[PDB]
Design a protein around this ligand. Structure first.
Ligand SMILES: [Mg+2]
Ligand SMILES: [Mg+2]
Ligand SMILES: [Mg+2]
Ligand SMILES: [Mg+2]
Lengths: 107, 226, 213, 251, 40, 457, 180, 190, 256
RNA sequence: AAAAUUUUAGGAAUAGUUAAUAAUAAUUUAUAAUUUUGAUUAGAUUGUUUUGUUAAUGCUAUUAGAUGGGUGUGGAAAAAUAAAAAAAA
């Protein structure tokens, strides 16, 4: 389970998955806690939308109308730039005031 | 796309046509579909020189000081009717005058009956809106002895190019149901004496001699002296 | 169609196999989350993001991706439109239609859908909330509609929402409902900013399946 | 134009450019516009070969409970005039709506009446069409309609149950487009008919001393025309046909 | 371009173009002729 | 150097048969499919997929040369596992067909015997599921926004949601050949062999099996008798090998193929076909020991019957004598039309038989040949509006029109029929168009476009 | 679809449009001027190279004396020469398979070369454009029309596959004794 | 014609025979620096600009160009450059994210010699196999989050030591004693 | 505004819908990241899957590594039980008694007629397989699910003597199912996933308990460490809960 | 969607911020991300076939052209003078 599949292109996490093996380093408290908090998102959500449809519907109104407000509605190469401040640095001083720096990550 | 002109042949841009297909060329704009249209500008364009020397009053001018002699009003009305037929007759102007609102009668526009072109409309039913001269008109198209299976909104009913002829035979009361006329190939056995086909799918008309004269006298084959 | 019964037949005749060893999961790969392209594409479970020339053993589907269609009223800026919106769940094979309704109710993110009680129906016929997908022959290819309480009242002007084009929206209803969230009185950034389709889009008669002229 | 692959452009939840879903309103004329030309095909089928659920007897009876999981989609023909239990009756006298039954009434059984029925709860529907007299189609002996008195008491009715404000799909008429022949024109040569000996063949084409009478001389149209119908992509009449063949348009 | 001659159906309007393309049957016939040639 | 899998071998052997070159099939056989086996009681199933798929241990990755690590998807790697479903019986069948095609009895006898024996005494192999990359998959769509069959109000447009025009050609209504039981496949194989006999007869005598191009169409070829002998011996061999088992499986396709052989090769009138089929079904009802209740002839069989009547009355048209027509010697229109009539009665009686455009075409043609002059009526009632049709119809029908009394009827009926072609989306063919053109002096009907003519000159 | 149309250089149907074969050169004193046959899109940008599918050749519109060939007493050959380099495989590819468009001047060239019949725009103003009527044409057509199958075979060999297999090469390619 | 002398020129419009059609860009311009600031106050904390700056990238002297000939292209056949990288895992503070340090090569053609530079990547490993100090194989893939285009394809060398260190409850590797350099003097006693 | 305009996690195309649909006709919504949520996250595990015919019949006997007294495993599982029951006492019927803990090395169907011949033969071949293998020290940490979340178990980490186990198992697999034809629920050329089954939902229970063990219970123990254990004893067992307070044992082999 | 190539004599911290969850979170969870292998601001500068000199590893040029959003039209924003692109006979 340490090697990826060359022709398949699936990673080592994959072929390990398929052989039904787990190589997972021992975890500290951070990771166990984050993970355990993540697993349950759907139970929590299910219980929420069943038991309390109103609060849910309010928040949904927010999201829905929000999609129509805002900066971009359209998802194109511009909107869909994974890094906006980096690919357009030439906007950063004058036009675009959101970002103070062109680089927040490795690349 | 669907149905080109001369297949794809690209040797010129005009070689294609003025439209590439009958279908809308962008799917986001449906109305670009190829119809048969009519010169709306000229055929609305009603003459305001018939309204000269008249004194029309208005709808909401009802005032006692406002209106005029009954004689004046009469000639005004006549000048207004003369204003509305001033180009040709709208369908709802023909149909209100016929019995049963002209259900069953065959409404043909002028150009549909001349040249090799042969077409008319068997009127199924009519809606007058509060205003006459406008409305909705449904019916069966009949084209070269071929007829529609179901009724259709009659297009350009509001454009004043329409003629028809009142026959008691075709009249239907509002009780019954206007039948679609027979398509001469199928429901009625075809006959030559009752109906002869003007033009058929591969046919076309012979050359008229004076057009030919004009074109040769143009291209400069047949001379022309001032 | 052809594929459905070809594959069903194949499954059925593969289960009646007397002698089979079983597959070797070393030879039967899963699917990758890692492939070129920006977009994440979800496929059939019998299909893969790599090229696999060999046909795999027919398996029975233990999660069936049902689609459930709703009617919605969209604000198109010349007035209201009625169009179609699907919800897509993954419903365990043997699940009860009651439970399917519940899945649906949990999986919609539109505030405009599940407001009152609704019944699932196929080709107009209501379904028993009591019984299984197995009995009604629901294959994931099946067309499943969803019928709300007030939906047979829509032909009137009441239940069908009132557009500020033709109707008064009053200080009563400015504080309630889609009317509130919409912000009718125009702002500088122009408000939620909905989609618009003009009046003359379809001509004088609206969109039809049958050509009306 | 072809339909594009997928929408990656706009959020799904908001759905953006969407052809409106067509709904059939029973209050208006448009309803009948959809349902009528179907009926005729349906009746035509009934005139030739048998279909199982078309002919039935003594209406139908179901509980309040199972009412909507059984009825909707149901279409059946009864002999007499009896209106279904628990339906408010609406007469269709409006001319426009009536108009669509034209083809069905002239070239099939004449339509005596049309009825829109709505139940107590308003959530169902019945379209009820009463025909008078015998068909103007011939009816075959082994056919479904041969089991009925109203054809071949001259009135009989077609009943169609449906839900309101639904797309013109889930009224189920398209399962009926099975096409069976009318065997009436060949019934003449069957061993059963006694007029089969009064038939005589034309094997050879008869000797022709004439030509077809030449068509009336062509008068070129005098008014203004919209230009080539070819280059404008107008089908020959604006009616039917291919845009490559320009026959019968002005020239 | 599409040639609009002077004897095309004139439109009287102050809100738009002065001449609509609409044809004298002669012009239509003529057009058909020239077109046939180009088809060749 | 790609090793063809079994499927590929099938395909190439199909090309071999259709080409009738035995030579190709022998080399192909000898090289690749030799060791191909059948499935026996001990043998197991679809074999599981056994290939590893290709990976690299870190030492393989680091120490090997570059080419050793280069995987292009290469067949020959998966060939073993493409063949895991055992399609062998298909290969043997094709091979029989070829050895017959190239006219060699011994080899054919060998293959067919092996196949037969194994089909009787060995278990039915599990068929492969539909290949994802050939036949694709039905992705989910709502059919809501659709053109609503009556869309154009001149005609019936077909639609994605339902098919309202009726089938253009009759389909056999049998699942793909690999899903069959072993016995069923035996039957299928006989029908296959017959079909190849037919095809070979049409490659030998192309003139005589074309309808009515030459009077040669009306008379049995020599060597047809020996052929039919072969067919008879074959079928009786099928009834000899398979016992009562035959009572449980579909004979429909087989029957239709036999009937089509005795319609084409030996020439039997419609009555003879209907008789043959009834005697056959009697035989199959009797061999199974039961109360009878025979299956009725399915739609395809009746299609062969009807095309039988159409062969019966057929005419070589416009001899160079300017003589009207030549006919089958010993032709009676009365009797023919009698039998056709009560046969159509028979069909339309049976509720489970679907009607197609081709069956109607055989009928219409039988009318035209018989000088019935009811052809028009039948066509317009039962076909025109309700089917998507060929122009072959209009060809037979023009022949009909030509024989009417006065000329104006001819002209007007023909013109009207062209309008039919323009309304109904039938692109009137060049055969028909020529048939009309030939009479131009008489009827004055122009068939060509303006454009087409100019360009032509 | 531009809000404010670029007014001077209009085109049909948006960008980049069809592939088209154009003749173009930078403008200079007539003495040195050359042209380029270029397959490129319909909508050009600032520099012609951004959309350039292929380069079909140089064309020089100066009649030249042939000093390459030895001076020849044959009359014809001492007419001046016009020099053009055609790339004919990219031409037949782009025009044939890819279905190009054509400006007029390139068309005239390709006509002088025997690749295309002369253009629409080459007019001896001596003759007029022809007249037409359907029934005379029809008489001529009824007079001469070839057989159906001859014509179908023509359309076969011209449009579809040309190279075919005669009996002999079949007989030559079929396997011999040990596998036969 | 670039090979013709200054005085040999006749026409400027064409090449008479062949050769290259060249544009003379004027390389010797005496371009100059403008001094807009006092040497005392320059408006930047780290770096100061006192002369003309050389402005290219790969036009930039002395030339340093991409070299795809190092170890990585030696072991792998890459469909696209950088589709494969071998590296060491440095840090896992992010769930399912392995940071990887990796070397690539640069070539100075002036000196005819190579240098290795180093670069960090974020790799997506589902399931958290990686420990700090593993030698991993890494691949280019679907954009996963803002910065992660690589996923952990295979562990070449695991950290046996580090894993054992983890099992016992201690961190995989001791945290570095000093952080980044400073320009200050930190006086912190006992 | 707090991040990317279109979050990359939200960019999803569904190719199992249809080419024309989502552009024009209708838009399809789903929560697509429940489905994408992976095998590590859900806690699923791919066990050797049975052929259909073998899938029909109940298993009878299995191979088991027997856990000694004084385990780290048993202790920590007991602590886990206490914690679980204090959280939710609905688990109570799911949980396996700490007395019944064992490692499952493979599962098998033995017909009741040939029973004696097969137990003798198996036991013999088994004793031959493990003759050379000395005791195994294996590591247990992490949880996983079989049968759609119906069976909840403790994984065996391949960090230790596990390697040997896999060869060992793969030997009996090729003997027991390969040599004398026996129904191993899988293919004898494939290796079984060894596991310690902790909680379980049987067919009879499934009505009152529910169709899947809710992951909220074992979420926090999903990666928990149960420790190392050395194992000298292999068993072949028929399944009965009654007889010893442990499974009825038809055979044994000592690793030494 | 990425990978490589990236200037300033004397050099310090940067920030709507990383990763997981998900069509969540102006207060989800976490021991987070960029930097001395030279970052971010700031100066200069139109990026990876174009020149000049030279016997030559060099030195010395290369124009121009993509500057955010706010009823989001359109296949694609490239959409507000400044062509030298024949733009549906
Ligand atoms: Mg980036
Ligand atoms: Mg700046
Ligand atoms: Mg196109
Ligand atoms: Mg702006």
């Amino acid at each position: 389970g340490l090697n990826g599949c060359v022709e398949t292109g699936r990673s080592r996490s994959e072929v390990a998955r398929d052989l039904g093996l787990s190589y997972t380093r021992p975890l500290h408290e951070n990771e166990k806690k984050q993970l355990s908090h993540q697993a349950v998102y759907y139970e929590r959500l299910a219980k929420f939308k069943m038991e309390q449809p109103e609060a849910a519907r309010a928040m949904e109104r927010e999201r829905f109308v929000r999609k129509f407000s805002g900066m971009f509605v359209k998802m194109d190469i511009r909107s869909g730039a994974p890094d906006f401040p980096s690919t357009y640095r030439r906007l950063l001083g004058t036009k675009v005031v959101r970002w103070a720096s062109k680089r927040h990550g490795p690349n | 796309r669907a149905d080109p002109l001369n297949g794809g042949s690209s040797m010129t841009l005009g070689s294609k046509g003025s439209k590439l297909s009958p279908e809308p060329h962008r799917r986001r704009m449906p109305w670009t579909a190829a119809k048969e249209y009519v010169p709306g500008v000229v055929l609305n364009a009603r003459d305001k020189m018939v309204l000269d020397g008249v004194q029309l009053l208005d709808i909401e001018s009802i005032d006692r000081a406002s209106q005029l002699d009954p004689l004046e009003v009469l000639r005004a009305v006549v000048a207004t009717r003369e204003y509305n037929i001033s180009t040709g007759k709208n369908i709802f102007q023909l149909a209100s005058q016929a019995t049963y609102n002209g259900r069953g009668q065959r409404f043909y526009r002028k150009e549909w009956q001349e040249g090799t072109y042969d077409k008319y409309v068997t009127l199924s039913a009519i809606d007058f809106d509060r205003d006459g001269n406008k409305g909705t008109a449904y019916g069966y198209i009949t084209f070269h002895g071929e007829t529609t299976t179901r009724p259709v909104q009659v297009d350009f009913a509001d454009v004043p190019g329409w003629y028809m002829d009142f026959v008691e035979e075709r009249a239907v009361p509002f009780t019954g149901i206007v039948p679609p006329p027979p398509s001469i190939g199928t429901d009625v056995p075809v006959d030559p004496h009752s109906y002869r086909l003007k033009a058929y799918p591969y046919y076309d008309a012979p050359n008229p001699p004076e057009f030919v004269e004009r074109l040769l006298k143009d291209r400069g084959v047949l001379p022309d002296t001032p | 169609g052809h594929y459905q019964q070809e594959a069903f037949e194949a499954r059925k005749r593969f289960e009646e196999s007397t002698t089979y060893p079983g597959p070797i999961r070393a030879a039967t790969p899963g699917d990758t989350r890692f492939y070129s392209g920006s977009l994440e594409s979800i496929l059939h479970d019998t299909d893969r993001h790599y090229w696999r020339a060999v046909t795999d053993d027919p398996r029975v589907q233990h999660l069936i991706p049902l689609r459930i269609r709703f009617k919605i009223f969209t604000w198109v800026t010349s007035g209201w439109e009625q169009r179609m919106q699907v919800v897509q769940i993954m419903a365990p094979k043997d699940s009860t239609i009651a439970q399917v309704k519940d899945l649906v109710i949990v999986e919609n993110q539109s505030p405009y859908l599940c407001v009152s009680s609704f019944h699932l129906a196929i080709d107009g016929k209501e379904l028993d909330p009591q019984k299984t997908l197995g009995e009604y022959g629901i294959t994931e290819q099946s067309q499943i509609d969803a019928i709300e309480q007030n939906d047979h009242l829509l032909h009137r002007d009441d239940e069908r929402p009132r557009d500020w084009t033709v109707d008064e929206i009053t200080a009563e209803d400015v504080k309630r409902s889609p009317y509130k969230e919409m912000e009718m009185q125009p702002l500088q950034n122009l408000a939620p900013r909905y989609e618009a389709r003009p009046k003359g889009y379809f001509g004088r008669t609206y969109y039809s399946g049958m050509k009306q002229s | 134009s072809r339909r594009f692959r997928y929408n990656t452009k706009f959020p799904a939840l908001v759905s953006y450019n969407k052809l409106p879903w067509e709904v059939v309103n029973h209050e208006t004329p448009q309803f009948h516009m959809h349902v009528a030309p179907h009926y005729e095909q349906l009746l035509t089928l009934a005139a030739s070969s048998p279909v199982p659920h078309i002919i039935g007897s003594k209406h139908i009876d179901v509980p309040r409970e199972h009412r909507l999981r059984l009825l909707p989609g149901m279409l059946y023909l009864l002999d007499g005039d009896t209106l279904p239990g628990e339906f408010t009756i609406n007469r269709v006298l409006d001319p426009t709506a009536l108009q669509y039954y034209g083809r069905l009434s002239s070239q099939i059984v004449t339509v005596e009446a049309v009825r829109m029925l709505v139940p107590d709860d308003l959530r169902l529907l019945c379209n009820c069409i009463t025909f008078k007299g015998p068909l103007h189609l011939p009816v075959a002996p082994y056919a479904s309609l041969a089991s009925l008195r109203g054809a071949s008491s001259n009135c009989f009715t077609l009943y169609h149950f449906v839900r309101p404000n639904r797309p013109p799909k889930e009224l189920q008429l398209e399962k009926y487009y099975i096409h069976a022949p009318c065997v009436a024109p060949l019934s003449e040569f069957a061993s059963n008919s006694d007029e089969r000996g009064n038939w005589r063949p034309r094997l050879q084409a008869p000797k022709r001393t004439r030509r077809a009478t030449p068509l009336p001389a062509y008068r070129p149209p005098q008014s203004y025309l919209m230009g080539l119908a070819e280059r404008l992509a107008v089908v020959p009449g604006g009616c039917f046909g291919r845009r490559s063949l320009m026959w019968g348009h002005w020239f | 371009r599409q040639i609009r001659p002077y004897y095309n159906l004139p439109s009287k309007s102050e809100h738009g173009r002065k001449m609509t393309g609409f044809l004298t049957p002669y012009r239509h016939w003529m057009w058909k002729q020239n077109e046939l040639w180009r088809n060749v | 150097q790609t090793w063809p899998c079994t499927a590929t071998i099938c395909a190439y052997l199909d090309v071999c048969v259709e080409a009738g070159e035995k030579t190709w099939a022998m080399e192909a056989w000898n090289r690749y499919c030799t060791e191909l086996k059948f499935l026996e009681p001990g043998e197991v199933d679809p074999k599981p997929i056994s290939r590893v798929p290709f990976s690299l241990t870190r030492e393989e990755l680091l120490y090997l040369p570059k080419w050793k690590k280069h995987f292009d998807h290469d067949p020959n790697l998966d060939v073993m596992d493409l063949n895991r479903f055992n399609r062998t019986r298909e290969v043997y069948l094709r091979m029989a067909q070829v050895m017959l095609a190239g006219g060699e009895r011994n080899a054919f006898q060998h293959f067919f015997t092996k196949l037969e024996e194994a089909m009787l005494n060995k278990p039915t192999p599990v068929p492969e599921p539909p290949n994802p990359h050939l036949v694709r998959r039905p992705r989910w769509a709502p059919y809501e926004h659709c053109k609503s069959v009556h869309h154009s109000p001149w005609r019936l447009q077909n639609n994605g949601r339902a098919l309202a025009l009726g089938p253009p050609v009759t389909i056999e209504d049998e699942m793909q050949s690999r899903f069959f039981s072993n016995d069923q496949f035996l039957v299928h194989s006989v029908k296959e062999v017959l079909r190849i006999v037919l095809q070979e007869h049409k490659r030998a005598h192309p003139t005589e099996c074309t309808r009515c191009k030459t009077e040669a169409f009306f008379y049995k070829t020599k060597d047809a008798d020996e052929t039919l002998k072969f067919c008879d011996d074959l079928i009786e061999r099928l009834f000899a090998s398979l016992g009562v088992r035959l009572s449980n499986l579909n004979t429909s396709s087989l029957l239709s193929t036999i009937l089509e052989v005795f319609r084409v090769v030996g020439k039997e009138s419609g009555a003879a076909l209907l008789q043959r089929a009834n005697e056959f079904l009697e035989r199959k009802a009797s061999l199974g020991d039961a109360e009878g209740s025979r299956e009725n002839l399915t739609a395809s069989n009746y299609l062969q019957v009807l095309s039988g009547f159409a062969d019966e009355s057929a005419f070589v048209y416009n001899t160079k004598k300017d003589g009207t027509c030549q006919y089958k010697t010993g032709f009676d229109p009365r009797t023919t039309m009698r039998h056709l009539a009560d046969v159509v009665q028979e069909i339309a009686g049976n509720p489970h038989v679907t009607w197609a455009a081709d069956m109607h075409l055989q009928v219409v043609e039988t009318m035209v040949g018989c000088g019935t002059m009811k052809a028009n009526d039948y066509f317009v009632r039962n076909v025109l509006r309700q089917f998507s049709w060929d122009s072959r119809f209009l060809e037979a029908l023009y022949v009909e029109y030509r024989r009417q009394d006065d000329v104006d009827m001819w002209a007007e009926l023909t013109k009207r029929a062209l309008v039919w072609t323009a309304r109904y989306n039938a692109p009137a063919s060049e055969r028909l168009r020529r048939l009309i053109e030939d009479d131009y002096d008489t009827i004055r009907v122009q068939t060509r476009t303006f454009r087409e003519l100019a360009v032509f000159q | 679809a531009r809000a404010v149309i670029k007014r001077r250089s209009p085109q049909l149907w948006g960008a980049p449009g069809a592939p088209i074969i154009r003749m173009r050169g930078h403008h200079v004193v007539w003495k040195f001027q050359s042209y380029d046959l270029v397959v490129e899109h319909t909508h050009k940008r600032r520099n012609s190279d951004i959309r350039l599918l292929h380069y079909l050749g140089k064309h020089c519109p100066h009649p030249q004396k042939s000093l390459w060939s030895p001076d020849t007493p044959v009359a014809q050959d001492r007419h001046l020469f016009m020099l053009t380099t055609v790339d004919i495989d990219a031409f037949k590819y782009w025009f044939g398979v890819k279905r190009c468009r054509l400006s007029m001047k390139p068309w005239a060239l390709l006509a002088k070369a025997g690749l295309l019949p002369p253009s629409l725009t080459q007019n001896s103003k001596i003759m007029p454009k022809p007249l037409f009527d359907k029934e005379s044409l029809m008489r001529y057509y009824l007079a001469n029309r070839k057989d159906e199958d001859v014509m179908a075979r023509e359309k076969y060999l011209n449009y579809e596959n040309s190279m075919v297999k005669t009996e002999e090469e079949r007989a030559a390619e079929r396997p011999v004794a040990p596998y036969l | 014609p670039w090979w013709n002398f200054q005085t040999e020129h006749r026409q400027r419009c064409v090449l008479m025979y062949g050769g290259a059609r060249t544009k003379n860009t004027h390389n010797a311009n005496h371009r100059v620096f403008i001094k807009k600031y006092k040497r005392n106050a320059f408006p930047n904390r780290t770096r100061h600009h006192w002369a003309v700056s050389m402005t290219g990238v790969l036009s930039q002297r002395p030339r340093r160009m991409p070299w795809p000939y190092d170890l990585t292209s030696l072991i792998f056949n890459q469909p696209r450059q950088g589709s494969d990288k071998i590296g060491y895992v440095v840090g896992t503070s992010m769930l399912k994210t392995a940071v990887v340090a990796t070397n690539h090569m640069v070539y100075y053609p002036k000196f005819n010699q190579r240098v290795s530079r180093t670069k960090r990547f974020f790799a997506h490993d589902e399931d958290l196999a990686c420990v700090e100090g593993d030698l991993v194989h890494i691949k280019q893939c679907r954009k996963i989050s803002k910065y992660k285009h690589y996923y952990v394809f295979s562990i070449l060398e695991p950290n046996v030591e580090g894993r054992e260190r983890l099992k016992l409850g201690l961190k995989a590797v001791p945290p570095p004693l000093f952080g980044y350099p400073v320009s200050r003097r930190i006086v912190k006693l006992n | 505004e707090r991040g990317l305009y279109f979050p990359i996690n939200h960019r999803i195309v569904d190719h199992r819908i249809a080419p024309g649909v989502t552009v024009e006709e209708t838009d399809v919504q789903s929560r697509y990241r429940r489905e994408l949520r992976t095998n590590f996250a859900t806690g699923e595990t791919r066990q050797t899957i049975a052929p259909p015919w073998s899938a029909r019949e109940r298993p009878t006997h299995f191979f088991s590594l027997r856990l000694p007294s004084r385990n780290s495993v048993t202790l920590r599982v007991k602590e886990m039980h206490n914690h679980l029951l204090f959280s939710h006492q609905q688990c109570a019927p799911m949980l396996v008694s700490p007395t019944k803990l064992h490692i499952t090395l493979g599962v098998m169907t033995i017909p009741e007629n040939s029973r004696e011949e097969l137990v003798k033969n198996i036991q013999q071949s088994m004793s031959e397989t493990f003759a050379c293998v000395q005791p195994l020290q294996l590591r247990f940490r992490g949880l996983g699910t079989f049968d759609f979340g119906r069976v909840l178990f403790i994984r065996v980490v391949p960090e230790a003597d596990f390697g040997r186990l896999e060869r060992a198992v793969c030997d009996i697999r090729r003997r027991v199912g390969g040599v004398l034809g026996v129904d191993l629920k899988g293919n004898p050329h494939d290796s079984y996933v060894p596991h310690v089954t902790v909680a379980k939902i049987r067919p009879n229970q499934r009505q009152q308990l529910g169709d899947t063990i809710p992951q909220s219970l074992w979420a926090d123990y999903q990666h928990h460490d149960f420790g190392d254990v050395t194992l000298s004893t292999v068993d072949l067992c028929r399944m009965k809960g009654s007889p010893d307070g442990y499974y009825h044992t038809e055979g044994a082999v000592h690793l030494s």
